Amino acid sequence: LQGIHLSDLSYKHAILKESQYTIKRDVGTTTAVTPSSLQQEITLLCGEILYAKHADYKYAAEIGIQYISTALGSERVQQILRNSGSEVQVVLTRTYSQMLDIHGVEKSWVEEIDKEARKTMATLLKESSGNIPQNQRPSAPDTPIILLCVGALIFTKLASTIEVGLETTVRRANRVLSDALKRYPRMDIPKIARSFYDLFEQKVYHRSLFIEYGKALGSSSTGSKAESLFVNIFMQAYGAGQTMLRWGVIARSSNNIMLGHVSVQAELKQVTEVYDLVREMGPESGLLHLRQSPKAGLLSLANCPNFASVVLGNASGLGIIGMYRGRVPNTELFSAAESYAKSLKESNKIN
Amino acid sequence: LQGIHLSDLSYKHAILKESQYTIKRDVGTTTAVTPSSLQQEITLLCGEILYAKHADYKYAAEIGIQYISTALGSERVQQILRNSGSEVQVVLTRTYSQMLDIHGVEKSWVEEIDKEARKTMATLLKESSGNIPQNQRPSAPDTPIILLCVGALIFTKLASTIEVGLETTVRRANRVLSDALKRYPRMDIPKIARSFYDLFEQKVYHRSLFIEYGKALGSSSTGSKAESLFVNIFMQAYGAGQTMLRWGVIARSSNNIMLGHVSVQAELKQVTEVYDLVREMGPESGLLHLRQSPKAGLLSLANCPNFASVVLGNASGLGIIGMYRGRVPNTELFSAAESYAKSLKESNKIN
RNA sequence: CCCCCCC
RNA sequence: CCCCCCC
RNA sequence: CCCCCCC
């Protein structure tokens, strides 16, 4: 019975990877970038969104991506978008009287944001004592990273739903971005997070651009505290969309007894096949669901309902499951595993 | 008695593979493609089929394949059709007053679809408040993928019959494509599925084209949710036409005792020969029945009636068999295996 | 179809 | 998010 | 002849 063996998942991945034809999408579309020579200007804009209370926050995500384009460069951004499987043609950014004319961003919106911020600055300078510290002004150099930090908070929740993503973004930004909130009392994290979620859903190639910024930021030798925060959040997004694999390795670490049941041991073979596929893809496997790479879904453990039920039960017993909205296929295994996991958690055994 | 050994299946595959002559079919036939430069137009068409209620849905499959041709490119599509063993000459697509003139698709049909959709758009804009969201309009960029998703749903049922294929397509599309159904309330999945089944049966080389799209989609680094859904369904079609091999490896995983009977052990040798042939073909073995490759049928286990009866009985015991319409050659083994499989399923044993 | 928690 | 002492 | 279920 040794030769009755199939190896379907390896075959599916082999078909998907060895393709001699390249897909083509977004052929007639264009997007905006800003060259690095305008960074000192875009910083102002990226901060002139933050300390004023604006009626419309529609293109804040585009301004964050513009700052990313200044950091990487126009040519590198065009190359990344082209190599992301999307033939979107970059349109450069110009200046006019100075302010920016970003492609796809109406000049009325930029003028409105600038005028609102100038009025707020005049109000906070006329009434107050004129003692604005160095960190409270819009031209601070970490403001674009603070906006990209809101973008990165909503980035970690791209596998989740929109409402959960916004709630988590606001909840985590009231604490993660406490210092920026103190510096800028009136920054509307909900609306900026909504703009960033809309951008990531509509223009999916900007997810690849956003990931390249994380790499270009993580590889740097030095950085400010805003950039260190951004990289921390970006790496917190790494295993997004594959929490089932992480909880499975957690269950294996917990030495759950129900892993030895007959059906779990039956499915362990193809489970190990999924993990082998993870290793085969390697470091870029974690970014599959963040990029919405169609190759994602080869890592799904949905074809092993009993293993998934045991792992979810173990997670629920340890309290890791939290408020996870996933499905439990086999409820009896789930309840037994949850009970055993709680029993193991309660007991304190030391070797 | 060691030398009394034949190895017929390896010899049959050796004859089939080592052929110095190439077959020629469809010599005088032609088909239509659309170059990538017209993608932004074809998208409109592929969506202008979806939100209106059309009397005739005859060429919807051809419009989906046209979008595939835009994605891959005209030259790559001609090369794939030529390398699929079919000498069909691609005819390019032109525009006229703008609309498309697709070869083999009557201009009356395209005009009818466009006019019906325009009338529906006028009716839903005049009566309603003129608040059409960004996802509900025909020019949405995932509409061609939604049509190809209906095509992929009926693609997974090409080994099955037409009526079963249509019923399964409608049943699965009411849930898989729920979001598109909400966005486009009036999309007739039955008629579009009928058009796609007709296309796949008549023009069999388009199955190869359709498979190339799946690969060109799976190899991409990023994709929208429609394309991720399409790749998920396309990979769900992988082992199509060879569920007997999958249920055999399932039975081996179940450690069915009746695998050790005399006749099953007699046939296990040539069964292992079939599985070895599967490995010999490798990753492309799963797509044999989807492509209607004549080499398919070398993977048939119909020459092992007792092994097939035991495997089907095991599947019926575990409940996997569902409503499978296959034949049970040896009924006694089938009933005993089904009884044992139910007994194993009922008992809950943990190691 | 997949995904879905917390930091 | 991370970090947080003493020399 | 082969294929035939569910997701």
Helix (H, G, I), strand (E, B) or coil at A31: strand
The alpha carbons of chain B give a radius of gyration, in whole angstroms, of 24
Task: From residue B226, give the alpha-carbon distance in Å to each of A264, A289, B141, B217.
Answer: 32, 14, 10, 11
Q: Provide the Cα torsion A57, A60, A62, A67; round to 10°.
A: 160
- Distance from CA(B170) to C1'(C3), angstroms, rounded: 23
How far off is chain B from A100, nearest CA to CA, in Å? 26
Q: Which of residues 299-328 of B touch strand E (CB under 7 A)?
A: 300-302, 320-327
Give bridge partners of residue B30 from the DSSP assignment: B89
Identify any residues that bridge with B167 across adjacent strands, giving them in sequence order: none
Of B71, B35, B82, B83, which is closest to residue B219 (Cα–Cα)? B71
Helix B143-155, helix B189-202: angle, nearest 10: 60
User: Which residues, 6 or more positions from B284, have their beta carbon under 8 angstroms from its beta carbon?
Assistant: A15
Measure the CA–CA gap between B65 and B33, rounded to whole angstroms: 8
| Interatomic CA distance for residues A339 and B327, integer angstroms | 44
Place of tokens 């993990």: A275
Contact at 8 Å (CB) between B242 and B299? yes
Return the closest-CA partner of residue A142 out of A42, A77, A259, A47.
A47
For chain B, percent helix, then strand, then coil, each to nearest 5?
60, 5, 35
* Resolution for this PDB entry, in angstroms: 3.3
DSSP A94: E
Q: Which residues of A touch B227 (CB under 8 A)?
A: 292, 294
Phi, psi of B30 (to 5 degrees): -140, 160
What 3-state class would DSSP assign to B298? Answer: coil
Q: Are A334 and A247 in contact (CB under 8 A)?
A: no
Give the span between the Cα atoms of A274 and B318, in whole angstroms.
Answer: 23
The helix or strand, by DSSP H or E, that contains position B137, with its residue range, turns out to be none
Whether B62 contacts B32, CB under 8 Å: yes
Residue keyed to tokens 């008549």: B202
Q: What residues of chain B, 299 to 318, have a C-beta less than 8 Å from chain A?
A: none
Q: Which of A139, A114, A140, A133 is nearest to A52 (CA)?
A: A114
Adjacent-strand bridge partners of A26 = none
Distance separating alpha carbons of residues B90 and B209, to the nearest angstrom: 12
How many angstroms separate the CA atoms of B260 and B254, rounded?
Answer: 13
Whether residue A346 lies within 8 A of chain B, CB to CB, comes out as: no
Answer for the pair B151, B158: CB distance below 8 angstroms, yes or no: no
| Cα–Cα distance for residue pair A81/A89, rounded to 1 Å | 8
- Backbone Cα Rg of chain A: 24
What does the alpha-carbon distance between residue B138 and residue B117 come to, in Å, rounded to a whole number? 9
Cβ contact B221:A83 at 8 Å: yes
Contacts of B15 (CB under 8 A, 6+ apart): none
Strand bridging mode B94-96 / B89-91? unpaired
DSSP string, A179-231: HHHHHSS---HHHHHHHHHHHHHH-THHHHHHHHHHHHHHT-S---HHHHHHH
Q: Which residues of B touch A4 (CB under 8 A)?
A: 248-249, 252, 268, 271-272, 275
Q: Is B317 strand, coil or helix?
A: helix
- Copy the structure tokens of residue A101: 């004319």
> Cα–Cα distance between A125 and A138 in angstroms, integer?
13
Which residue is associated with the tokens 């993977």?
Answer: B299
Report the chain B residue with the minimal C-alpha distance to residue A290.
B222
Output DSSP code: residue B284.
Answer: G
- The protein footprint on chain E, as nucleotides within 7 A of a CB, is 1-7
Nearest by Cα to B102 from B42, B53, B28, B162: B42
Strands B89-91 and A99-101: unpaired
Q: Is the CB of B172 under 7 A from strand E?
A: yes
Cα B302 to Cα B311: distance, rounded to the nearest angstrom: 12
CB-hemisphere CA count at 13 Å for A187? Answer: 29
**What is the residue type of B22?**
T
Q: What is residue A33's three-state secondary structure? A: coil
Torsion sign, CA atoms A235, A236, A239, A240: negative
What does DSSP assign to residue B63?
H
**Spatial separation of the C-alpha atoms in residues A295 and A181, rounded to whole Å:** 39
Tokens of A41: 């200007």
Distances (CA, A) of B296 to A10, B85, B287: 20, 15, 9
The CB-side HSE value for A128 (13 A sphere, CA atoms) comes to 10
Residues A313, A345: contact at Cβ < 8 Å? no
A175 Cβ within 7 A of any nucleic strand D atom = yes
Q: A99: which strand partners?
A: A96
Length of chain A in terms of residues written: 351
**Strand pairing partners for A94?**
A101
Burial label for A268, CB within 10 Å (0-12, 13-18, 19+), is: middle
Q: Which secondary-structure segment (H or E) carries B105?
A: none
A195, A57 Cβ separation under 8 angstroms: yes
Q: Are B68 and B208 in contact (CB under 8 A)?
A: no
Closest CA to B256 of B178, B348, B340: B340
CA-CA distance, A269 to A259, in Å (whole number)? 12
> Measured at the alpha carbon of residue A75, what is the angle toward residues A71 and A78, in degrees to the nearest 5?
100
Which residues share a beta bridge with B96?
A: B99
Breaks (C-N over 2.5 A) in chain B follow: 97
Closest among A164, A154, A195 to A66, alpha carbons compared: A195
Give CA torsion, residues A227, A232, A234, A237, to 10 deg. Answer: -170
Can you say how many angstroms the Cα of residue B230 is from the centroid of all Cα atoms in its chain?
Answer: 11
Q: Which H or E run contains B90?
A: strand B89-91
Nearest to A233 by CA among A146, A138, A320: A146
Residue A110: helix, strand or coil by DSSP?
Answer: helix
- What separation, in Å, do the N-terminal and C-terminal C-alpha atoms of chain B show? 42
d(CA B11, CA B16): 9
C-alpha dihedral (A44, A46, A48, A49), degrees to nearest 10: 170
Which ranges constitute the DSSP H helices of B84-177?
A: 107-126, 143-155, 162-176
The rounded distance, in Å, linking the Cα atoms of B317 and B319 is: 5
What the block records as the tokens of B252 is 């081996």
First-to-last C-alpha distance (Å) of chain A: 42
Q: Are B253 and A56 in contact (CB under 8 A)?
A: no
Q: Any idea what DSSP says for residue A105?
A: S
| CB contact at 8 A, B21 and B79 | no
**DSSP classification of residue B56:** -
What is the Cα–Cα distance from B111 to B116, expressed in whole angstroms? 8
- Cβ–Cβ < 8 Å for B55, B117: no
In this structure, which amino acid lies at residue B209? L
Question: Residue A83's Cα: distance from chain center in Å?
Answer: 20
Q: Are B180 and B235 in contact (CB under 8 A)?
A: no
Compute CA A317 distance to the chain's CA centroid, rounded to the nearest angstrom.
28
Q: Can you read off the two tokens belonging to residue A4? A: 């009755």
CB contact residues (below 8 A), chain B span 217-276, against chain A: 217-225, 227-228, 230-232, 235, 238-239, 245-246, 248-249, 252-254, 259, 268, 271-272, 275-276
Q: How far is CA B166 from CA A170, A264, B173, B214, in A?
A: 46, 35, 10, 21
The Å distance, CA of B53 to C1' of E4, is 33
Residue B112 to residue B99: CA distance in whole angstroms? 12
Scan for tokens 């809950």, then name that residue.
B348
In degrees and rounded to multiples of 5, residue A31 shows phi and psi of -140, 165
What is the β-pairing status of strands A94-96 and A99-101? Answer: antiparallel
Which are the contacts of A220, defined by CB distance < 8 A and separation ≥ 6? A227
Helix (H, G, I), strand (E, B) or coil at B101: strand
B104 phi-psi bin (left φ>0, alpha ψ -120 to 50, beta other): left
Could you tell me the two tokens for B97? Answer: 């007053």
Question: Is the CB of residue B210 less than 8 Å from the CB of residue B156?
Answer: no
- CB of B224 within 8 A of CB of B145? yes
Signed CA dihedral, B67, B70, B74, B77: sign only: negative
- Could you tell me the two tokens for A237? 């997004």
| Two tokens, residue A319 | 């309290």
Residue B53 Ramachandran class (φ > 0 left, ψ -120 to 50 alpha, else beta): beta
Q: d(Cα A18, Cα A222) in Å, to the nearest integer?
A: 39
Burial of B261 (0-12, 13-18, 19+ CB in 10 A): middle
H helices present in chain B, as ranges: 8-17, 39-48, 60-72, 74-83, 107-126, 143-155, 162-176, 178-183, 189-202, 205-218, 225-236, 243-254, 262-281, 305-318, 331-346
| Cα–Cα distance list, A235 to A165, B65, B204 (Å) | 17, 40, 47
Q: How far apart are the C-alpha atoms of B299 and A305, rounded to whole Å? A: 28
- Listed by range, residues with Cβ under 7 angstroms from strand C are A 156-157, 159-161, 164-165, 167-168, 171-172, 175-176, 236, 241-244, 246-247, 289, 296-297, 300-302, 320-327; B 172, 175-176, 179, 225, 228-229, 232-233, 236
